Amino acid sequence: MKLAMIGFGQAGGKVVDKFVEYDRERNAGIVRAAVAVNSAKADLLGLKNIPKDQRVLIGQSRVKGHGVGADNELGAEIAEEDIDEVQGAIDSIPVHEVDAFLVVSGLGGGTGSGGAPVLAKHLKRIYTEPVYGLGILPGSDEGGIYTLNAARSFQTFVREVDNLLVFDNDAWRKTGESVQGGYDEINEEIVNRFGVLFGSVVDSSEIINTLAGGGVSTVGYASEGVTAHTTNRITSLVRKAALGRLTLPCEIEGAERALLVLAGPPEHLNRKGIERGRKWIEEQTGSMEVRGGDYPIPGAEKVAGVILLSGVTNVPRIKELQQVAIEAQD
Ligand SMILES: Nc1nc2c(ncn2[C@@H]2O[C@H](COP(=O)(O)OP(=O)(O)O)[C@@H](O)[C@H]2O)c(=O)[nH]1
């Protein structure tokens, strides 16, 4: 699937940057365009893979290149005031050549938290391709203000995209490590999962149709190196992905639609594993629709299974954020 990726804020920027590197290393053809938007000048300079002409500094009149800290209200205001700066950069993207936009951002801060939903709304207003969000939730160790920002940002972001894919840092914390060291490993985990998803063969239509019901999505993932053997290995990965740690933890029962993706060398893929996998996923989810296919990749030394679950509900983490936002209103 061909994406226009826009990273918003420091986290969104680093994730999109890594996505570009991943896509390039594997010749995956995923990141057709990459743009980074920030109010902190130093953050944009630190990027490695996003073209300098696609790094947009906004809010100069308000924060003079110094960021908005964790003031997401100000983040939303600068995104609204300076949306034409962002559009300036987007105008260089060959939009006719993309299947969808993806707006990537941490929700706990200020620039991305406030600006990502503003951008998503702007994009849906002028383009007709789907606009998805990838929202990254904060660690519970960061502090109450970051949780509150995320709660408020989530409420708005989910309403402005066609679907909000979620990755929760709190479920993926790396304990013994430095903050930045933790983010480097987390960003690898993020890109390996969504990179496999966006990479009979699964086409973009199947992804778009899986996401079309809107709301929140979560991704399961398992991988391993290296006819019954093939089938059983596949069904095992499917189980490991469904029961393993999700990008956003939740009960998978009640998901609206599911998509199974198997990626690997053709000789270690077959139809039977995928068909059994789809039935098993339906048993575990009760999903309305369960699609499944593969990404044949010659020369690959790993097989990876990804399950995309769209329209998940009764998610404790989401119910927490809603409660957090509601209390702060009152
Ligand atoms: N996965 C990931 N999350 C990050 C990273 N950096 C920051 N975060 C998370 O993103 C939130 C916003 O931080 P940041 O993007 O720097 O703030 P912003 O630039 O004001 O939007 C933080 O509260 C963290 O939860 C990163 O490199 N990777």
Tab-separated table of C-alpha atoms and ligand atoms in Angstrom:
chain	number	residue	atom	x	y	z
A	1	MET	CA	0.000	0.000	0.000
A	2	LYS	CA	1.307	3.437	-0.995
A	3	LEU	CA	1.207	6.014	1.797
A	4	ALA	CA	1.785	9.710	2.264
A	5	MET	CA	3.227	9.805	5.784
A	6	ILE	CA	3.241	12.983	7.871
A	7	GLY	CA	4.974	12.944	11.246
A	8	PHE	CA	3.743	15.606	13.665
A	9	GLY	CA	5.813	16.587	16.702
A	10	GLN	CA	9.065	14.961	17.783
A	11	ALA	CA	7.788	11.371	18.197
A	12	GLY	CA	5.789	11.390	14.959
A	13	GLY	CA	8.857	12.731	13.186
A	14	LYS	CA	11.177	10.019	14.502
A	15	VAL	CA	8.698	7.264	13.667
A	16	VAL	CA	8.171	8.481	10.089
A	17	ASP	CA	11.948	8.871	9.731
A	18	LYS	CA	12.394	5.228	10.781
A	19	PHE	CA	9.555	4.128	8.503
A	20	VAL	CA	11.429	5.705	5.589
A	21	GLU	CA	14.578	3.760	6.509
A	22	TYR	CA	12.646	0.498	6.909
A	23	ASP	CA	10.870	0.998	3.589
A	24	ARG	CA	14.162	1.791	1.863
A	25	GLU	CA	16.036	-1.200	3.352
A	26	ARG	CA	13.364	-3.606	2.141
A	27	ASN	CA	12.345	-1.806	-1.045
A	28	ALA	CA	8.815	-2.195	0.296
A	29	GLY	CA	7.350	0.642	-1.778
A	30	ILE	CA	5.279	1.891	1.165
A	31	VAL	CA	6.393	5.461	1.885
A	32	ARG	CA	5.611	7.271	-1.357
A	33	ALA	CA	5.991	10.596	0.434
A	34	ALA	CA	7.265	11.579	3.859
A	35	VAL	CA	6.807	14.944	5.601
A	36	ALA	CA	7.704	16.090	9.149
A	37	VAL	CA	5.968	18.973	10.917
A	38	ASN	CA	7.249	20.482	14.153
A	39	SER	CA	7.519	23.740	16.095
A	40	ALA	CA	10.896	22.816	17.528
A	41	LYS	CA	13.713	23.510	15.091
A	42	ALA	CA	16.270	21.233	16.731
A	43	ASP	CA	13.944	18.208	16.271
A	44	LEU	CA	13.690	18.709	12.512
A	45	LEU	CA	17.468	19.019	12.163
A	46	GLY	CA	17.879	15.663	13.892
A	47	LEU	CA	15.956	13.742	11.242
A	48	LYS	CA	18.016	11.650	8.861
A	49	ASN	CA	15.809	10.356	6.072
A	50	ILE	CA	13.134	12.968	5.478
A	51	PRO	CA	14.125	15.486	2.756
A	52	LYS	CA	14.973	18.946	4.151
A	53	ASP	CA	12.340	20.468	1.872
A	54	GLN	CA	9.762	18.163	3.518
A	55	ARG	CA	10.582	19.299	7.058
A	56	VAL	CA	8.142	22.051	8.007
A	57	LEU	CA	8.693	24.404	10.928
A	58	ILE	CA	5.448	25.962	12.168
A	59	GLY	CA	4.529	28.325	14.980
A	60	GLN	CA	7.577	30.527	14.452
A	61	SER	CA	5.574	33.668	15.273
A	62	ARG	CA	4.531	32.131	18.626
A	63	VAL	CA	7.462	30.031	19.817
A	64	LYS	CA	10.375	31.048	17.586
A	65	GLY	CA	11.555	27.498	16.904
A	66	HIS	CA	11.465	26.433	20.543
A	67	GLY	CA	8.428	24.165	20.549
A	68	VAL	CA	5.225	24.446	22.574
A	69	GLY	CA	6.382	22.026	25.254
A	70	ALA	CA	3.331	20.026	26.321
A	71	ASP	CA	0.829	22.801	25.681
A	72	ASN	CA	-1.373	20.984	23.212
A	73	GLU	CA	-3.920	23.808	23.124
A	74	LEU	CA	-1.167	26.055	21.759
A	75	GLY	CA	-0.121	23.165	19.501
A	76	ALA	CA	-3.589	23.152	17.985
A	77	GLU	CA	-3.562	26.945	17.547
A	78	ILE	CA	-0.235	27.016	15.693
A	79	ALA	CA	-1.287	24.137	13.455
A	80	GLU	CA	-4.416	26.082	12.538
A	81	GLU	CA	-2.581	29.387	11.979
A	82	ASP	CA	0.224	27.831	9.970
A	83	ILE	CA	-1.632	25.077	8.080
A	84	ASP	CA	-0.635	26.693	4.777
A	85	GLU	CA	3.041	26.112	5.612
A	86	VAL	CA	2.276	22.429	5.950
A	87	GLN	CA	0.164	22.452	2.777
A	88	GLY	CA	3.066	24.121	0.997
A	89	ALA	CA	5.121	20.967	1.583
A	90	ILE	CA	2.237	18.609	0.830
A	91	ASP	CA	1.826	20.358	-2.542
A	92	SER	CA	5.075	18.695	-3.660
A	93	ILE	CA	3.743	15.203	-2.887
A	94	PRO	CA	2.422	13.233	-5.883
A	95	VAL	CA	-0.939	12.673	-4.184
A	96	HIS	CA	-2.463	10.906	-7.212
A	97	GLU	CA	0.087	8.149	-6.562
A	98	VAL	CA	-0.939	7.361	-2.981
A	99	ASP	CA	-3.649	5.078	-1.595
A	100	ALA	CA	-3.949	6.934	1.705
A	101	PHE	CA	-2.518	9.537	4.073
A	102	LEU	CA	-1.128	8.536	7.471
A	103	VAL	CA	-0.741	11.178	10.191
A	104	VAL	CA	1.640	9.938	12.868
A	105	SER	CA	1.978	11.535	16.307
A	106	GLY	CA	2.529	11.071	20.013
A	107	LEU	CA	-0.612	12.146	21.832
A	108	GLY	CA	0.973	13.038	25.175
A	109	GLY	CA	2.820	16.216	24.155
A	110	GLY	CA	1.958	19.580	22.617
A	111	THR	CA	2.855	19.937	18.942
A	112	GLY	CA	1.699	16.553	17.661
A	113	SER	CA	-1.046	16.199	20.257
A	114	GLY	CA	-2.716	19.453	19.203
A	115	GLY	CA	-1.653	19.611	15.555
A	116	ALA	CA	-2.250	16.078	14.264
A	117	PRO	CA	-6.062	16.298	14.501
A	118	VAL	CA	-5.966	19.739	12.874
A	119	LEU	CA	-3.970	18.326	9.981
A	120	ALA	CA	-6.221	15.258	9.634
A	121	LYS	CA	-9.286	17.489	9.334
A	122	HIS	CA	-7.507	19.727	6.796
A	123	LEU	CA	-6.516	16.704	4.699
A	124	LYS	CA	-10.034	15.206	4.623
A	125	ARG	CA	-11.312	18.611	3.564
A	126	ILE	CA	-9.201	18.921	0.415
A	127	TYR	CA	-8.369	15.321	-0.577
A	128	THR	CA	-10.636	12.338	-1.235
A	129	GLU	CA	-8.196	9.527	-0.381
A	130	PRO	CA	-8.588	7.934	3.087
A	131	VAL	CA	-6.795	9.752	5.924
A	132	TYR	CA	-5.637	7.540	8.775
A	133	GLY	CA	-4.027	8.391	12.090
A	134	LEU	CA	-1.339	6.529	13.998
A	135	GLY	CA	-1.676	7.790	17.550
A	136	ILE	CA	0.974	6.871	20.093
A	137	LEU	CA	-0.211	6.829	23.722
A	138	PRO	CA	2.124	7.853	26.547
A	139	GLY	CA	3.718	5.734	29.239
A	140	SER	CA	1.938	5.907	32.576
A	141	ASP	CA	5.291	6.863	34.121
A	142	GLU	CA	5.504	10.163	32.175
A	143	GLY	CA	3.186	12.220	34.356
A	144	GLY	CA	-0.453	13.226	34.670
A	145	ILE	CA	-0.206	16.123	32.220
A	146	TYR	CA	0.877	13.746	29.443
A	147	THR	CA	-1.999	11.386	30.188
A	148	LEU	CA	-4.422	14.343	30.123
A	149	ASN	CA	-3.012	15.648	26.831
A	150	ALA	CA	-3.411	12.195	25.313
A	151	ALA	CA	-6.983	11.873	26.532
A	152	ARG	CA	-7.936	15.238	24.982
A	153	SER	CA	-5.971	14.606	21.790
A	154	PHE	CA	-7.452	11.120	21.375
A	155	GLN	CA	-11.029	12.451	21.569
A	156	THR	CA	-10.402	14.881	18.712
A	157	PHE	CA	-8.022	12.780	16.608
A	158	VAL	CA	-10.339	9.748	16.461
A	159	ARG	CA	-13.135	11.960	15.153
A	160	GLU	CA	-11.033	13.546	12.381
A	161	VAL	CA	-9.542	10.464	10.722
A	162	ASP	CA	-11.165	7.615	8.788
A	163	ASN	CA	-9.568	5.265	11.332
A	164	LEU	CA	-7.171	5.713	14.210
A	165	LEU	CA	-4.501	3.034	14.490
A	166	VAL	CA	-3.116	3.082	18.034
A	167	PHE	CA	0.208	2.124	19.590
A	168	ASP	CA	0.340	2.401	23.394
A	169	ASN	CA	3.826	3.157	24.795
A	170	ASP	CA	2.563	2.138	28.231
A	171	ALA	CA	2.184	-1.489	27.084
A	172	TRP	CA	5.640	-1.509	25.516
A	173	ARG	CA	7.772	0.201	28.175
A	174	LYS	CA	11.422	-0.827	28.386
A	175	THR	CA	12.373	-0.760	32.061
A	176	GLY	CA	16.139	-1.037	32.534
A	177	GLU	CA	16.790	1.455	29.768
A	178	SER	CA	17.183	5.168	29.278
A	179	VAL	CA	14.193	7.102	27.947
A	180	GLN	CA	15.724	7.601	24.518
A	181	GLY	CA	17.117	4.064	24.324
A	182	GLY	CA	13.631	2.805	25.075
A	183	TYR	CA	12.131	4.912	22.281
A	184	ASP	CA	14.656	3.561	19.755
A	185	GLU	CA	13.542	0.004	20.454
A	186	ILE	CA	9.875	0.970	20.627
A	187	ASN	CA	10.115	2.756	17.273
A	188	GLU	CA	11.585	-0.428	15.740
A	189	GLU	CA	8.641	-2.398	17.123
A	190	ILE	CA	6.208	0.147	15.704
A	191	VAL	CA	7.736	0.113	12.233
A	192	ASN	CA	8.125	-3.701	12.017
A	193	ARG	CA	4.439	-4.137	12.762
A	194	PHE	CA	2.891	-1.425	10.619
A	195	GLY	CA	5.544	-1.984	7.973
A	196	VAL	CA	4.407	-5.585	7.548
A	197	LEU	CA	0.755	-4.553	7.400
A	198	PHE	CA	1.151	-1.791	4.805
A	199	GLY	CA	3.670	-3.716	2.740
A	200	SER	CA	-3.809	-14.576	-3.051
A	201	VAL	CA	-1.967	-11.315	-2.359
A	202	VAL	CA	-3.291	-8.656	0.017
A	203	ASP	CA	-4.096	-5.467	-1.860
A	204	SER	CA	-4.715	-1.927	-0.582
A	205	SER	CA	-8.457	-2.373	-1.082
A	206	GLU	CA	-8.509	-5.056	1.591
A	207	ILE	CA	-6.766	-2.786	4.073
A	208	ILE	CA	-8.967	0.187	3.245
A	209	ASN	CA	-12.106	-1.942	3.517
A	210	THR	CA	-10.949	-3.383	6.851
A	211	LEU	CA	-10.492	0.140	8.236
A	212	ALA	CA	-13.609	1.629	6.649
A	213	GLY	CA	-15.903	1.218	9.657
A	214	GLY	CA	-13.823	3.789	11.543
A	215	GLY	CA	-12.982	4.084	15.222
A	216	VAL	CA	-9.858	2.582	16.767
A	217	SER	CA	-7.614	-0.181	15.405
A	218	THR	CA	-4.983	-2.390	17.018
A	219	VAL	CA	-2.334	-4.672	15.529
A	220	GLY	CA	-1.148	-8.129	16.601
A	221	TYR	CA	2.173	-9.495	15.384
A	222	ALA	CA	4.375	-12.561	15.469
A	223	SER	CA	7.399	-13.585	13.427
A	224	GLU	CA	9.976	-16.336	13.174
A	225	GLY	CA	12.995	-17.278	11.079
A	226	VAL	CA	13.265	-19.958	8.389
A	227	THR	CA	2.403	-29.084	3.184
A	228	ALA	CA	1.332	-29.857	6.756
A	229	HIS	CA	4.492	-28.249	8.111
A	230	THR	CA	3.805	-25.043	6.203
A	231	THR	CA	0.134	-24.993	7.235
A	232	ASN	CA	0.852	-25.609	10.930
A	233	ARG	CA	3.640	-23.011	11.067
A	234	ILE	CA	1.248	-20.434	9.633
A	235	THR	CA	-1.625	-21.242	11.965
A	236	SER	CA	0.826	-21.085	14.887
A	237	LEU	CA	2.011	-17.591	13.927
A	238	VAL	CA	-1.635	-16.560	13.595
A	239	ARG	CA	-2.342	-17.747	17.142
A	240	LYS	CA	0.829	-16.122	18.523
A	241	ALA	CA	-0.062	-12.817	16.881
A	242	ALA	CA	-3.663	-12.858	18.106
A	243	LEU	CA	-2.778	-13.825	21.679
A	244	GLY	CA	0.475	-11.883	21.933
A	245	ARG	CA	0.988	-8.250	22.907
A	246	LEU	CA	-1.076	-5.894	20.734
A	247	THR	CA	-0.077	-2.354	19.721
A	248	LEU	CA	-3.121	-1.347	21.775
A	249	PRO	CA	-4.020	-4.009	24.363
A	250	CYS	CA	-7.691	-5.023	24.393
A	251	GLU	CA	-9.958	-8.038	24.193
A	252	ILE	CA	-10.090	-9.051	20.538
A	253	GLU	CA	-13.648	-10.333	20.877
A	254	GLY	CA	-16.062	-7.799	19.395
A	255	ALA	CA	-13.700	-6.277	16.814
A	256	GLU	CA	-15.680	-5.102	13.793
A	257	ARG	CA	-13.404	-6.397	11.029
A	258	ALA	CA	-10.150	-8.355	10.943
A	259	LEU	CA	-7.407	-8.717	8.359
A	260	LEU	CA	-4.741	-11.393	8.479
A	261	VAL	CA	-1.468	-10.752	6.701
A	262	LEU	CA	1.283	-13.345	6.215
A	263	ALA	CA	4.607	-12.053	4.896
A	264	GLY	CA	7.533	-14.195	3.838
A	265	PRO	CA	9.191	-16.182	1.056
A	266	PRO	CA	6.592	-17.808	-1.251
A	267	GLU	CA	7.864	-21.324	-0.515
A	268	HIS	CA	6.896	-20.948	3.162
A	269	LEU	CA	3.404	-19.603	2.428
A	270	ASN	CA	0.270	-21.492	1.373
A	271	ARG	CA	-3.486	-21.010	1.016
A	272	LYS	CA	-4.494	-23.605	3.595
A	273	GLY	CA	-2.735	-21.933	6.523
A	274	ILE	CA	-4.360	-18.624	5.700
A	275	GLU	CA	-7.828	-20.140	5.310
A	276	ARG	CA	-7.520	-22.014	8.624
A	277	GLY	CA	-6.119	-18.808	10.097
A	278	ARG	CA	-9.139	-16.764	9.000
A	279	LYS	CA	-11.574	-19.286	10.499
A	280	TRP	CA	-9.646	-19.386	13.766
A	281	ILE	CA	-9.613	-15.562	13.936
A	282	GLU	CA	-13.367	-15.513	13.396
A	283	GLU	CA	-13.779	-17.974	16.289
A	284	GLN	CA	-11.682	-15.758	18.556
A	285	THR	CA	-13.203	-12.401	17.580
A	286	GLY	CA	-16.720	-12.891	16.266
A	287	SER	CA	-15.746	-10.283	13.642
A	288	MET	CA	-18.280	-9.320	10.993
A	289	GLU	CA	-15.715	-9.954	8.244
A	290	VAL	CA	-12.340	-11.688	8.245
A	291	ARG	CA	-10.045	-11.075	5.309
A	292	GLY	CA	-6.718	-12.791	4.800
A	293	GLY	CA	-3.849	-12.952	2.349
A	294	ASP	CA	-0.088	-12.835	2.027
A	295	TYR	CA	2.856	-10.707	0.966
A	296	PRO	CA	5.154	-13.018	-0.985
A	297	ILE	CA	8.732	-11.781	-0.494
A	298	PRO	CA	11.436	-13.819	-2.258
A	299	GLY	CA	14.703	-14.040	-0.323
A	300	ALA	CA	13.058	-13.269	3.018
A	301	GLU	CA	14.484	-15.258	5.920
A	302	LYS	CA	11.559	-14.513	8.238
A	303	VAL	CA	7.867	-15.295	8.169
A	304	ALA	CA	5.681	-12.719	9.901
A	305	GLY	CA	1.973	-12.778	10.683
A	306	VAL	CA	0.048	-9.574	11.328
A	307	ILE	CA	-3.537	-9.252	12.445
A	308	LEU	CA	-5.252	-5.907	12.008
A	309	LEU	CA	-8.342	-5.528	14.165
A	310	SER	CA	-10.460	-2.508	13.332
A	311	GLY	CA	-13.330	-1.133	15.377
A	312	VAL	CA	-12.283	-2.522	18.746
A	313	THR	CA	-14.555	-1.582	21.654
A	314	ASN	CA	-14.741	-1.692	25.470
A	315	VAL	CA	-11.007	-1.021	25.517
A	316	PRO	CA	-9.937	-0.327	29.135
A	317	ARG	CA	-7.202	2.077	28.049
A	318	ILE	CA	-9.668	4.056	25.912
A	319	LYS	CA	-12.266	4.058	28.690
A	320	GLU	CA	-9.584	5.448	31.035
A	321	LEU	CA	-8.743	8.319	28.686
A	322	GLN	CA	-12.419	9.167	28.188
A	323	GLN	CA	-12.829	9.306	31.978
A	324	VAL	CA	-9.685	11.449	32.308
A	325	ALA	CA	-10.959	13.905	29.680
A	326	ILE	CA	-14.456	14.017	31.197
A	327	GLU	CA	-13.212	14.778	34.720
A	328	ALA	CA	-10.996	17.604	33.454
A	329	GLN	CA	-14.000	19.154	31.706
A	330	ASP	CA	-16.147	19.105	34.836
B	1	LIG	N1	7.070	5.649	20.367
B	1	LIG	C1	7.653	6.837	20.653
B	1	LIG	N2	6.999	7.696	21.466
B	1	LIG	C2	7.559	8.883	21.779
B	1	LIG	C3	8.880	9.240	21.249
B	1	LIG	N3	9.174	10.471	21.737
B	1	LIG	C4	8.122	10.865	22.503
B	1	LIG	N4	7.183	9.897	22.541
B	1	LIG	C5	5.861	9.955	23.180
B	1	LIG	O1	5.232	11.050	22.477
B	1	LIG	C6	4.691	12.004	23.375
B	1	LIG	C7	4.869	13.402	22.813
B	1	LIG	O2	6.259	13.738	22.813
B	1	LIG	P1	6.801	14.670	21.611
B	1	LIG	O3	6.506	14.077	20.275
B	1	LIG	O4	8.263	14.948	21.823
B	1	LIG	O5	5.954	16.000	21.877
B	1	LIG	P2	5.584	17.075	20.752
B	1	LIG	O6	6.766	17.284	19.832
B	1	LIG	O7	5.238	18.312	21.530
B	1	LIG	O8	4.358	16.646	19.988
B	1	LIG	C8	5.499	11.790	24.641
B	1	LIG	O9	4.690	12.170	25.746
B	1	LIG	C9	5.819	10.302	24.637
B	1	LIG	O10	4.705	9.548	25.120
B	1	LIG	C10	9.524	8.251	20.359
B	1	LIG	O11	10.655	8.461	19.848
B	1	LIG	N5	8.860	7.111	20.126
